[PDB]
Amino acid sequence: GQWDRLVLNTPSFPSNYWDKFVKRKVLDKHGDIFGRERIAELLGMDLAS
Amino acid sequence: KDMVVMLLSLLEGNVVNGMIARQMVDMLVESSSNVEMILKFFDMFLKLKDIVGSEAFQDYVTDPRGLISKKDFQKAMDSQKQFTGPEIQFLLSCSEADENEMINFEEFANRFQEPARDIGFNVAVLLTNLSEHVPHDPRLRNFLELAESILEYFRPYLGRIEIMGASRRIERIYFEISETNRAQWEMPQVKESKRQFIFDVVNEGGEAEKMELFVSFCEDTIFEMQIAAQISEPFWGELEVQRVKFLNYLSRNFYTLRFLALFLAFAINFILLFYKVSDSPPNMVYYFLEESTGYMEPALWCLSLLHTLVAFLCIIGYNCLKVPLVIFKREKELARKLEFDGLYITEQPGDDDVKGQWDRLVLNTPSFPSNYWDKFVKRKVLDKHGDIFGRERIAELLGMDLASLEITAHNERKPDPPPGLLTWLMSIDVKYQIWKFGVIFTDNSFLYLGWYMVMSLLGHYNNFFFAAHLLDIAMGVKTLRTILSSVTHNGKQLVMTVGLLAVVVYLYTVVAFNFFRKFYNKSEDEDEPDMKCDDMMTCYLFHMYVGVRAGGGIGDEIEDPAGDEYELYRVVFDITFFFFVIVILLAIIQGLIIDAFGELRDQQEQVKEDMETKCFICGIGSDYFDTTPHGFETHTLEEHNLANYMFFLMYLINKDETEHTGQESYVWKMYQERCWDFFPAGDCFRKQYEDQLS
Amino acid sequence: MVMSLLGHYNNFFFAAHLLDIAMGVKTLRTILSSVTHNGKQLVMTVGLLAVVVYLYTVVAFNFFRKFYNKSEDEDEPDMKCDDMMTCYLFHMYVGVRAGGGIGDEIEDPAGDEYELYRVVFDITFFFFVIVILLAIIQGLIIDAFG
Amino acid sequence: ELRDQQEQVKEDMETKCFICGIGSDYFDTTPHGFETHTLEEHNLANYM
Ligand SMILES: Nc1ncnc2c1ncn2[C@@H]1O[C@H](COP(=O)(O)OP(=O)(O)OP(=O)(O)O)[C@@H](O)[C@H]1O
Ligand SMILES: Nc1ncnc2c1ncn2[C@@H]1O[C@H](COP(=O)(O)OP(=O)(O)OP(=O)(O)O)[C@@H](O)[C@H]1O
Ligand SMILES: CC(=O)CCCCn1c(=O)c2c(ncn2C)n(C)c1=O
Ligand SMILES: [Ca+2]
């Protein structure tokens, strides 16, 4: 887990694994409770983009 | 909460699709809007609590005092999106906002939790009961969905069991489980005790006595729980409180002290490896360490002192932690034997029962039921057996003052004695103490600890005695314990095999003495002959000592028979020795060890298979339950959880008797009468209501 | 790869690559898995053997030093158990390997006051180490097969 | 082989009636049913 922390903010996170929308799904799931901006910072997400 | 209790009392004895349950559902439907309002009240405040705990709300919080503006609160809530705008307005109205409109969200959330808890739990129980007893009603589903949050919150605290009731029908019982009880159960020591109990009952436990053993395990578990609570970390009085703190610390850290003692023993022996013996000092030899540093010699003295101290501390910790359960079980079994078996009143011990002869003492002692909860066992035993066996004789046996018994009931008396050392000494009960000390000294763990202590003391006399403490690794390590249990499993057989080997070697010795003496010279010089078998005893020692150790037998170690009239007799002698002793008997030892491994393995495997295949309570197999998906898992976790049965026992104990329901009073009465028929056996809610449920 | 590179430096490093047969062959993989199944138990058994040999070494040092001469010439005595460390090494190295134990490798006790103590010493060493502990290893392997 | 022989004897006796041939499951449908069946209903000592 400590190692896996790194790849989260990386753009390439779901390279081999098919699900490329996991970040948006995780955001839609947990952003109301945990903060959208914080989820985006964790996952390397540009909300404006 | 009281009204809901009345409703549940109406539901007592309800069958599936019962008229009263359907009537309750119809009433709820008629009152749907207000039911919705109540459920919404509860869920809103629960979500308020979880939100305020949420860090996102803290982001909106920007004031050092910890207060929040009403506008900021509304923005936080609309960001969370759980609440509608009317709900946010109502929450703001309930919030006590100062003239500045700032709010203490902490108190705002915590205000309604405790007041609404009991009603919330009773509502959850009501909805659950109605859902299970009316499985197919669309109208109840809406209420369940609205109560989802309440049900989720109270899920860990809702305990569900099944019993066989006076209706002669399986019945489902819902009750409350306390956080403290659940945590105490989840403590690892209780988990290990449960595992050992399961192993014991499955391997060597009968179905008839399984329930009795389970109840005894639950009671012992309760005693361990209260001991753990007592030791749990939060001039005479100062001395006593510091003493209690020290003893509680020892009880809590007993195992750590054991590991520390192991570490010190290992270090001491590592140092001892450096010892050397010389004729000269650094006609008698001198033993001394050989280390250039000069620091290890003081270190050995210090380590010996600390190891000795830790052994003493471990003994004290054992006395404080573990002996209470030993005495509790001993007192309990004696009390049950008196009340139900009527042992010392009618039967008397076999006279080969040292434990009974010893237990005779504590009966007349006042302190008899010290650890064990039942303080009225003497009066109960008297009321039971006094008409037949004589009240005065029962009182003499049990140290009872009949005149005092009635006056205690007549009037309450408080002859409190002022605290004094002399008063404490007079109070001490020497006979009960002697009985306790006998029990403890018979206890094996205490004996091993005392031997540990004594060997450390002897190590202070001669440091090499400390090596014995290295043997503690067997008890310290489960792996070595099991490996050695492989040997112990067949130890009697191994000893008998060794005796048989002795007998065969003795017969071979007889043959050699009478016929083969000439061959046993072991001296190179002819002038000085060393003959082993001129004496029987010496011949026997020679055989048992050299021949058994030799791969080829004694023929390896004695003179060649070539060119002798007895050559063929001796070749038979040697080959038969080799095959019977070196090959077969050894083979017997190897095979006994291997079979011990297999037996232990199949024991664990059998325990696991039985638990995965059957309910510990029902006795019903996993196949019937798995007819429904995940049915066995649901049955074990929810329907027939043994931990839930234990929690029910605790809940009954802590609940007032006037407050018990019919079900609870029924089960409690069977507990007191030690009747286990309320436990379901061969029946379940599903099986009873199969046609209706499906 | 690294061992091949080192083989280029010294050709004998290439022998390590012969160990690849275990992963190459399912049969050897299973046979070795028989050992691995109970490897922790085997290591603990070895440690226990070390402990028992250490205790026997202690007894020999305190009581049975005279018997541990291994020099033929009287002028030059080679005594193994004048030092604990050396006594422990001697035991663990010769006695365990010996079928009859350390008594096979040390001086006969006949005509000595400690003769019976030493016969007990030798027989108990033989039974506890040569017979039982080894037996534990064999049985662990067999149980792994089963 | 000797161990599994004794174990098999024990399992068979605890699982079936020496007389009926019926298993303990059917009887344990009723509580303690197998024990009652063996002691009272179909005791071989009672047959003797
Ligand atoms: N009446 C019963 N009550 C509870 N468990 C039962 C019962 N009958 C059979 N079982 C089996 O008991 C097992 C209980 O699991 P167990 O307590 O051993 O879990 P664990 O691995 O120690 O971890 P944990 O309890 O923390 O999840 C369940 O798998 C279930 O198969
Ligand atoms: N038809 C049967 N009649 C009697 N016993 C049966 C029968 N079928 C199976 N059994 C089994 O036989 C066992 C009889 O017990 P057994 O005679 O071996 O007891 P014990 O340990 O020798 O002691 P004791 O008879 O003194 O209580 C019972 O446990 C029962 O499970
Ligand atoms: C219920 C049974 O047979 C085992 C006894 C242990 C349960 N139990 C009690 O019943 C009890 C009690 N204190 C008062 N009472 C009536 N404690 C502590 C207890 O464990
Ligand atoms: Ca009442």
Q: How does DSSP assign B508-525, residue by residue?
A: HHHHHHHH-SGGGB--SS
Of D26, D34, D38, the one to substitute when testing ligand 2's pocket (max ligand atoms within 8 A of C-beta) is D38
The amino acid at B200: D
CA of D41 to the centre of ligand 2 (A): 13
Q: How far is the CA of B617 from the centre of ligand 1 (A)?
A: 12
Q: Which amino acid appears at position B324 of this protein?
A: P
- Give the span between the Cα atoms of C25 and C21, in whole angstroms: 6
HSE (CB half, 13 Å, CA atoms) of C16? 11
CB atoms < 10 A from the CB of C92, how many? 18
Cα distance between residue B215 and residue B210, in whole Å: 9
Atom of ligand 1 nearest to the CA of B617: 1
How many angstroms separate the CA atoms of A25 and B668, rounded? 53
Q: What is the 3-state secondary structure (H, E, C) of B2-57?
A: HHHHHHHHHHCCCCCCCHHHHHHHHHHHHCHHHHHHHHHHHHHHHHHHHHHHCHHH
* H/E run at residue B480: helix B478-489
Q: In the structure encoding, which two tokens stand for residue B483, read together?
A: 């490996």
Helix axes B179-186, B188-204, angle to 10 degrees: 70
Spatial distance between the Cα atoms of B121 and B650, rounded to a whole number of angstroms: 18
Let me know: does B590 contact C138? Beta carbons within 8 Å.
yes
In terms of phi and psi (left: phi > 0; alpha: psi -120 to 50; beta: otherwise), the region of B630 is: left
Closest to B595 (Cβ–Cβ): which among D3, D25, D29? Answer: D3
Q: What is the longest distance spanned by two Cα atoms in chain A? A: 30
Give the closest residue to B159 by CA, choosing from B632, B615, B640, B625.
Answer: B640
Alpha-carbon gap, residue B300 to C117, rounded angstroms:
29
B vs D: CB pairs below 8 A: 18
- Residues B475, B445: contact at Cβ < 8 Å? no
Question: Helices in B322-390 by DSSP H: which ranges?
Answer: 323-336, 354-359, 377-389
- Please, what's the largest Cα pairwise distance for chain D? 35
Nearest ligand (C-alpha, residue B636): 1
Is residue B367 within 8 Å of residue B432, measured between CB atoms?
yes
**Nearest C-alpha to atom 13 of ligand 3 is from which residue?**
B373
**Counting atoms of ligand 2 from 1, which one is nearest the CA of D13?**
9
Q: How far is the alpha carbon of A31 from chain B, nearest alpha carbon, in Å?
A: 8
For residues B668 and B189, the answer to whether their CB atoms sit within 8 Å is no
Positions of E strands within B452-586: none
User: Would you state the structure tokens that stand for residue B182, as one six-digit string?
Assistant: 């659940």
**Are B314 and B261 spatial neighbours (Cβ–Cβ below 8 Å)?**
yes
Q: Which of D24, D1, D29 is nearest to D12 (CA)?
A: D24
Q: Is B670 in the pocket of ligand 3 (CB under 6 A)?
A: no
Which residue of B181, B217, B219, B331 sits with most ligand 3 atoms within 8 Å of its CB, as the best mutation to test the pocket?
Answer: B219
Which candidate, B389, B412, B411, B392, places its Cα nearest to that of B401? B392
Contact B682 D29 (CB under 8 A): yes
B269 φ, ψ (degrees, to nearest 5): -70, -35
Tokens, residue B586: 């050894």
Whole-number Å distance between alpha carbons of B596 and C132: 13
Per-residue DSSP letters for B437-470?
HHHHHHSHHHHHHHHHHHHHHHHHHSGGGGGGGG
Distances, alpha carbon B684 to alpha carbons B162, B619, B639, C81, D27, in Å: 7, 10, 9, 72, 16
Alpha-carbon torsion, ordered C8, C12, C14, C17, to 10 deg: -160
C-alpha distances in Å from residue B400, one per residue of A37, B360, B383, B417, B462 = 77, 15, 13, 21, 53
How far is residue D28's CA from residue D37's CA, in Å, rounded to a whole number?
10
CA B345 to chain centre: 33
Angle at CA B59, nearest 5°, toward B54 and B64?
A: 105
- Grouping H, G, I as helix, E, B as strand and the rest as coil, residue B628 is coil
What is the C-alpha to C-alpha distance for residues C126 and C104, in angstroms, rounded to an integer?
A: 10
Query: What tokens were used for A27?
Result: 């955001």
CA distance B296 to B625: 66
Is residue B285 exposed (0-12), middle (13-18) or buried (19+ Cβ within 10 Å)?
exposed
C4 φ/ψ sector (left φ>0, alpha ψ -120 to 50, else beta): alpha
Following CA atoms B38, B44, B46, B48 in sequence, which dihedral angle do they give, to the nearest 10 degrees? -150
A16-47 b/e with 16+ CB inside 10 Å = b? Answer: eeeeeeebeebbeeebbbbbbeebbebbebee
Q: What is the dihedral of CA B174, B179, B185, B186, to 10 degrees?
A: 120
| Rounded Cα distance, C81 and C11, in Å | 42
The CA-to-CA distance between both ends of chain B, in Å, stands at 33
From chain B, the residues in CB contact with A33 under 8 A are 51, 54, 56, 80
Q: Which residues of A touch B59 (CB under 8 A)?
A: 35
Closest Cα to atom 31 of ligand 1 = B612
Q: Which residues from D are below 8 Å from B when comparing CB atoms?
A: 3, 25, 28-33, 35
C-alpha of A43 from chain center: 3
- The Å distance, Cα D12 to ligand 1 centre, comes to 28
Chain A to chain B, count of Cβ pairs less than 8 Å apart? Answer: 15
Distance CA B382, CA B387 (A): 8
The residues that bridge with A36 in the sheet, in sequence order, are none
Chain B neighbors of D31, CB-CB under 8 A = 677, 681-682
Opening angle at CA B110, ends B105 and B115, nearest 5? 145
Interface residues of chain B, partner chain A, Cβ below 8 Å: 51, 54-56, 59, 79-82
Which among B277, B586, B601 has CB closest to C65?
B277
CA of B334 to the centre of ligand 2 (A): 28
**The two three-digit tokens of residue B449, written as one number:** 């600890």
| Ligand closest in space to the Cα of D32 | 2
Under 8 Å between Cβ of B435 and B225: no
Distances (CA, A) of B325 to B320, B371, B509, C55, C61: 10, 8, 55, 36, 44
Structure tokens at C110: 């006949």
Chain pair B-C, CB pairs under 8 angstroms:
95
Q: Quick one: tokens of B462?
A: 């001669």
**Tokens representing residue B445 in the block:** 């763990």
Closest CA to A36 of C36, B115, B81: B81
Closest ligand 3 atom, residue B674 Cα = 3
Residue B644 Cβ inside 6 Å of ligand 1? The answer reads no
Contacts of B661 (CB under 8 A, 6+ apart): B8, B9, B12
Within its chain, how far is the Cα of B653 from the centroid? 20
Question: Which residue's structure tokens are 């091993």?
Answer: B448
Report the distance separating Cα B648 and Cα B642, nearest Å: 10
In terms of C-beta density within 10 A (0-12 exposed, 13-18 middle, 19 or more buried), how is residue B647 classed? buried
Of B55, B59, B79, nearest to A32 by CB-CB distance is: B79
Q: What is the resolution of this structure in A?
A: 2.7
Distance CA C107, CA D30 (A): 73
CB B189 within 8 A of CB B229: no
How many Å apart are CA C130 and CA C99, to the nearest integer?
7
Q: Which two tokens stand for residue B584?
A: 């077969």
What chain B residue is nearest to D4 in terms of C-alpha separation? B599
Q: How far is the CA of B365 from the centre of ligand 1 (A)?
A: 43
Neighbour count for residue C20 (Cβ, 10 Å): 9
Residue with CA nearest ligand 2 atom 29: D14
- The burial of B229, by beta-carbon neighbours within 10 Å (0-12 exposed, 13-18 middle, 19 or more buried), is given as exposed
B268 and B300 Cβ atoms separated by less than 8 Å: yes
Contact predicate B51/B82, CB 8 Å:
yes
**Cα–Cα distances in angstroms (integers) from residue B360 to residues B10, B66, B331, B353, B386, in the given order:** 51, 67, 12, 11, 18
* Interchain proximity A32–B82, CB inside 8 Å: yes
C48 contacts in chain B (CB < 8 Å): 473-474, 480, 483
Q: Chain D residue with minimal CA distance to B681?
A: D31
The ligand that comes nearest to the alpha carbon of residue D23 is 2
What separation, in Å, do the N-terminal and C-terminal C-alpha atoms of chain A show? Answer: 28
3-class SS of residue B349: coil
| DSSP H stretches of helix in A1-49 | 22-34, 36-43
Nearest ligand to the CA atom of D34? 2
Cβ–Cβ < 8 Å for B172, B162: yes
Q: State the Cα–Cα distance between residues A24 and A45, nearest whole angstrom.
A: 9
Torsion of CA A3, A4, A9, A12, to 10 degrees: 110
Ligand nearest D24 Cα, by number? 2
To 10 degrees, what angle do helices B138-146 and B113-133 make? Answer: 160
Residue C97 · residue B520 · CB < 8 Å: no
Contact B399, B363 (CB under 8 A): yes
By the 10 Å C-beta count (0-12 exposed, 13-18 middle, 19+ buried), B536 is classed as middle
- What are the Cα distances from residue C11, in Å, to A29, B215, C19, C20, C22? 60, 71, 16, 17, 22
For the stretch B214-220, contacts whose Cβ atoms lie closer than 8 Å and that sit 24 or more positions apart, written own/partner, are B214/B616, B214/B642, B214/B645, B215/B649, B215/B671, B215/B676, B216/B332, B217/B193, B218/B645, B218/B646, B218/B649, B219/B332, B219/B649, B220/B193, B220/B325, B220/B328, B220/B329
Indicate the residue type of B492. K
Contacts of C88 in chain B (CB under 8 A): 273
Known binding residues of B for ATP are: 191-195, 611-616, 636-642
Angle at A24 between CA A20 and CA A30, to 5 degrees: 135
Instruction: Give the ligand 2 atom nearest the CA of D17.
Output: 8
Contacts of B546 (CB under 8 A, 6+ apart): B554, B557, C100
The span from the CA of B667 to the CA of B644, in Å, is 14
Residue B436's Cα: distance from chain center in Å? 22
Instruction: Work out whether the CA dihedral B348, B350, B356, B357 comes out positive or negative.
Output: positive
Cα–Cα dist B220/B214, whole Å: 10
Is-contact A36 A42, C-beta < 8 A? no
Tokens found for residue B651: 């809940």
**CA distances in angstroms from A11 to A17, A30, A45, B29, C124, listed in the order given:** 13, 20, 8, 53, 69
Residue B411, amino acid:
N
Give chain D positions within 8 Å (CB) of B681.
28, 31-32
Can you tell me the distance from the alpha carbon of B390 to that of B34, in angstroms, rounded to the nearest whole number?
A: 66
- CA-CA distances (angstroms) from residue B214 to B335, B436, B681, C39? 18, 26, 14, 37
Q: Which residues contact C133 (CB under 8 A, 6 or more apart)?
A: C45, C48, C49, C52
**Whole-number Å distance between alpha carbons of B356 and B346:** 14
Query: Could you give the CA distance from residue B218 to residue B346 in angstroms, rounded to a whole number?
Result: 30
How far is B499 from B102, CA to CA, in rounded Å? Answer: 90
Question: What is the token pair recorded at B314?
Answer: 């471990």
CB-hemisphere CA count at 13 Å for A33? Answer: 11
Q: Please tell me the distance from the alpha carbon of residue B17 to that of residue B692, in angstroms, as a whole number.
A: 8
Q: Do C122 and B549 touch (CB under 8 A)?
A: yes
Distance CA B559, CA D38 (A): 67
Interface test with A, best of B47, B51, B55 (most A CBs within 10 A): B55
Give Cβ neighbours of residue B122 (< 8 Å, ≥ 6 apart): B1, B4, B5, B8
Whole-number Å distance between alpha carbons of A32 and A39: 10
C-alpha closest to that of D14 among D40, D46, D37: D37
Cα distances from B54 to residues B49, B71, B286, B323, B537, in angstroms, run 9, 18, 73, 47, 87
Site to substitute for ligand 2 among D6, D12, D18, most atoms within 8 A of C-beta = D18
Spell out which residues of chain C touch residue B479, defining contact as CB-CB under 8 Å: 40-41, 44
Helix (H, G, I), strand (E, B) or coil at C124: helix
Q: Is B158 helix (H, G, I), strand (E, B) or coil?
A: strand
Residues of B at the D interface (Cβ-Cβ below 8 Å)? 207-208, 595, 599, 619, 621, 677, 681-682
Please name the residue that has the structure tokens 């049900």: B151
**Ligand 1 neighbourhood includes B612 CB (under 6 angstroms):** yes
